[PDB]
């Protein structure tokens, strides 16, 4: 539906070229180079060269820049012609069309300003959203944090006044994609799992990748009861899971309790997470997280399990399984205490009364602090 301006594929490719091991990748360069020449991205090239120390093609740039100039002039000529002869509908589209060319050419700042001017004059609520959505994509493409949050606030407010379902469905993914990059995974699970059945924003990502993200984020977020009813038995998620078997093995292996393949399947999910432009800063926090759930899930049933069994069940040595439990137990993530002399791990899961009482002290203590904090004030 919406335009592919800006192409998030370009952003993902550039981040991949930024990564050390892939900095020398040639296939990425062709695809990144292919996108620039096809859409005539002159300014982005400059930004691309300066960041990655690439060599600028003067002939391409001059022809591109002249093409950009003549194209920009043509839009400028069209804008002037519309102003003298046409009404606000034609100037509105002309200004709206003008910015879209800034998007295609990589001019971050110029695109933001041109669009902002259009939103000032745009009247129809339907057109207002499209420009708002347009800024959001710019933010994600450049990872411009403040822009993505501000427009998101605009989108929510604009939609609430008058919002058709089609745009609200789209915003749900747009809110979600940001959430993955701010490491707010739980909200990404709610946002995506409510639009997996009706994913209509093909601009951001292909459908196979949207479900692939959903399985990645769903597992870290949902508890086993919710994961079963909303992902494993989910109609749409499984269907595209027949074309991405590796993610299928990853999702099921945790649910079916095949931990040997889950850890091995996690190695792929850790490497893949390193290359995505969105899951890059969060890959380490992710592989750690699913690791804790894997351990805690197995220990949920066994009270005291031999560390020899855990190493065999996880297909990892006795030493490594002892180590990770040690590092995780300390941070208060796993409820267990490793007995190294006998190599036996005993679980310390609080009784229902204990946890409720503990919660009364904590939740109660926070409240009494406030009452004391307030009590002093008013009593003077």
């Amino acid at each position: 539906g919406l335009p592919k301006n800006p192409d998030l594929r370009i952003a993902q490719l550039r981040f991949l070229l930024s990564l050390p091991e892939h900095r020398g990748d040639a296939a990425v360069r062709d695809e990144l180079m292919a996108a620039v020449r096809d859409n005539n991205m002159a300014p982005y090239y400059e930004a691309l060269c300066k960041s990655l120390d690439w060599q600028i093609d003067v002939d391409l740039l001059n022809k591109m820049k002249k093409a950009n100039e003549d194209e920009l002039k043509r839009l400028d000529e069209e804008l002037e012609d519309a102003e003298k002869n046409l009404g606000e509908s034609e100037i509105r589209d002309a200004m709206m069309a003008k910015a879209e060319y800034l998007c295609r050419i990589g001019d971050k700042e110029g695109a933001l300003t041109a669009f902002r001017k259009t939103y000032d004059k745009t009247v129809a609520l339907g057109h207002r959203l499209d420009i708002v959505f347009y800024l959001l994509r710019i933010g994600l493409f450049y990872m411009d944090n403040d822009l993505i949050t501000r427009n998101t606030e605009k989108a929510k407010s604009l939609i609430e006044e008058g919002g058709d379902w089609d745009r609200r469905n789209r915003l749900k993914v747009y809110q979600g994609l940001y959430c993955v990059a701010i490491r707010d995974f739980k909200q990404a699970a709610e946002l995506f799992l409510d639009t997996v059945s009706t994913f209509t924003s093909y601009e951001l990502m292909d459908y196979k990748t949207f479900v692939t993200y959903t399985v990645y984020v769903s597992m870290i977020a949902l508890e086993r009861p919710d994961l079963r009813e909303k992902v494993i038995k989910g109609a749409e998620i499984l269907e595209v899971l027949h074309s991405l078997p590796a993610v299928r093995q990853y999702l099921f292996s945790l649910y079916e309790c095949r931990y040997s393949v889950f850890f091995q399947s996690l190695a792929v999910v850790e490497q893949e997470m390193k290359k995505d432009w969105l899951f890059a800063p969060h890959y380490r926090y992710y592989v750690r997280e699913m690791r804790i759930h894997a351990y805690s899930q197995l220990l949920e049933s066994y009270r005291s399990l031999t560390l020899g069994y855990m190493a065999e069940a996880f297909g990892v040595g006795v030493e490594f399984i002892d180590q990770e439990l040690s590092r995780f137990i300390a941070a208060g993530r796993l409820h267990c205490k490793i007995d190294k002399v006998n190599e036996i791990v005993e679980t310390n899961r609080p009784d229902s009364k204990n946890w409720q009482y503990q919660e009364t002290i904590k939740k109660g203590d926070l409240l009494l602090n406030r009452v004391q904090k307030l009590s002093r004030v008013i009593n003077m």
């Binding site: 439990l325 040690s326 009364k353 009494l368 002093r376 008013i378 009593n379």
Partner: protein, 443 residues
């Protein structure tokens, strides 16, 4: 200039604020409630700023002006405005009111404002002469309300001396002046004086001298939140140095909790500085949400590299940080405490091992804590066990550090005792709320 015209409007409003203060100040004197003054004194910091030479002159030409020597004392000490066009005679005292000597509350309040202006004007000596005379005035003055206004001036007077950078001349004065309050059962004045006194003590590192003063003295329980927060930090600083770590955390965390939500970017900065270092020496890795906060982000970043060192236990990294960021610690007054840590990094890892492992064989403890020999850990393993950083028993018969078998607490008496301290405070809050309830004498 319109800026000063709003300023005099600010002056008159501050005069009206002062007149509000003075009218409330004169209200409390005849209102039979010292509480009223506290409102004027809390606006004091707010009205403390927003004043130039014309302000006090018209105030002192508006207030006082009884031909009393008072005018002769502060008028020369502050620049007098010219024949301003807007000569709004702001005289809350008219004739007889002018004839009547200013109540010790307003005079000090006006004089303090001059004192504040003296501070605001860096005139700590004219304020010194102003202030000590203020004290020389209020030293004799024995009212019940002036103790409040005296208390505020004291810290400013301590503050005027604070900018005077002596702090020993007022060491005795604040030390004796304190005793005047305690022999009066006065509440606020004793609180304010003690905090300024203690600041004096730590400023020269007489922790021994300071540790005594808190030992015999009793801080009024019904004290200002602002003060209660201060005393807790100074006691925390003293306790931490005295090697009473566990109590240092409890007071400092409690001192931090009492910080005036968001006004004092500084106090929260320093306390967190000690809390992070205090916590490390006790074997607890401090909260991470601290180091990311806006106000304390760069301020505590110097301590950040430290707490990362302790958890990593990479002594080479720990020394490297002291070499670089260490010098900055001295100004914060923490270098010494960090030096304790350098030969105490082993404790936490002993705690980390006791928190996760439950029967770790000693030889294994040596491997996971970098201890040179299995024998060396034994003293350290026991010592951490001995010092109550662990809850384990070392069965030397076979070299395994057993951890204590944790019990179902809800079936033991711990939860009841925790509820008692809670209920007693909850009931007390009801009494304190009900006890005051300040039903105004039915008009």
């Amino acid at each position: 200039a319109a800026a000063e015209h709003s300023q005099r409007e600010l002056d008159t409003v501050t005069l009206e604020d002062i007149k509000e203060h003075v009218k409330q100040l004169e209200k409390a004197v005849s209102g039979k409630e010292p509480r009223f003054v506290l409102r004027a004194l809390r606006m004091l910091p707010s009205t403390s700023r927003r004043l130039n030479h014309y302000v006090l002159y018209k105030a002192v030409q508006g207030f006082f002006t009884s031909n009393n020597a008072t005018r002769d004392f502060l008028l020369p000490f502050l620049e007098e405005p010219m024949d301003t066009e807007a000569d709004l005679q702001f005289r809350p005292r008219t004739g007889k009111a002018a004839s009547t000597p200013l109540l010790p509350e307003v005079e000090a309040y006006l004089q303090l404002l001059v004192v504040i202006f003296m501070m605001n004007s860096k005139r700590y000596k004219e304020a010194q002469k102003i202030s000590d005379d203020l004290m020389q005035k209020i030293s004799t003055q024995n009212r019940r309300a002036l103790d409040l206004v005296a208390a505020k001036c004291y810290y400013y007077h301590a503050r005027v001396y604070e900018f005077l950078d002596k702090l020993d001349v007022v060491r005795s004065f604040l030390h004796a002046r304190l005793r005047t309050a305690t022999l009066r059962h006065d509440a606020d004045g004793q609180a304010t004086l003690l905090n300024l006194l203690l600041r004096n003590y730590l400023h020269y590192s007489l922790y021994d001298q300071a540790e005594k003063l808190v030992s015999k003295s009793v801080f009024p329980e019904q004290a200002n939140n602002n003060e209660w927060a201060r005393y807790l930090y100074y006691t925390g600083r003293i306790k931490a140095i005295q090697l009473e770590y566990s109590e240092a955390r409890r007071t400092m965390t409690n001192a931090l909790r009492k910080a005036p939500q968001h006004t004092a970017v500084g106090f929260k900065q320093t306390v967190h500085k000690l809390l992070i270092v205090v916590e490390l020496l006790l074997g607890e890795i401090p909260d991470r949400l601290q180091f990311r906060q806006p106000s304390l982000k760069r301020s505590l970043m110097p301590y950040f590299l430290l707490t990362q060192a302790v958890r990593t236990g990479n002594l080479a990294k720990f020394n490297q940080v002291l070499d670089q960021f260490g010098e900055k610690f001295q100004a914060d007054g923490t270098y010494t405490l960090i030096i304790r840590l350098r030969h105490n990094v082993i404790k936490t890892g002993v705690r980390m091992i006791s928190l996760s492992y439950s029967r770790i064989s000693l030889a294994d403890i040596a491997q996971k804590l970098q201890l040179d020999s299995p024998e060396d850990a034994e003293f350290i393993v026991a010592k951490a066990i001995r010092d109550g950083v662990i809850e384990a028993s070392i069965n030397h018969e076979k070299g395994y550090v057993q951890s204590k078998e944790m019990i179902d607490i809800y079936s033991t008496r711990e939860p009841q005792l925790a509820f008692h301290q809670r209920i007693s405070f909850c009931l007390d809050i009801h009494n304190m709320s009900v006890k005051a309830m300040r039903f105004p004498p039915k008009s």
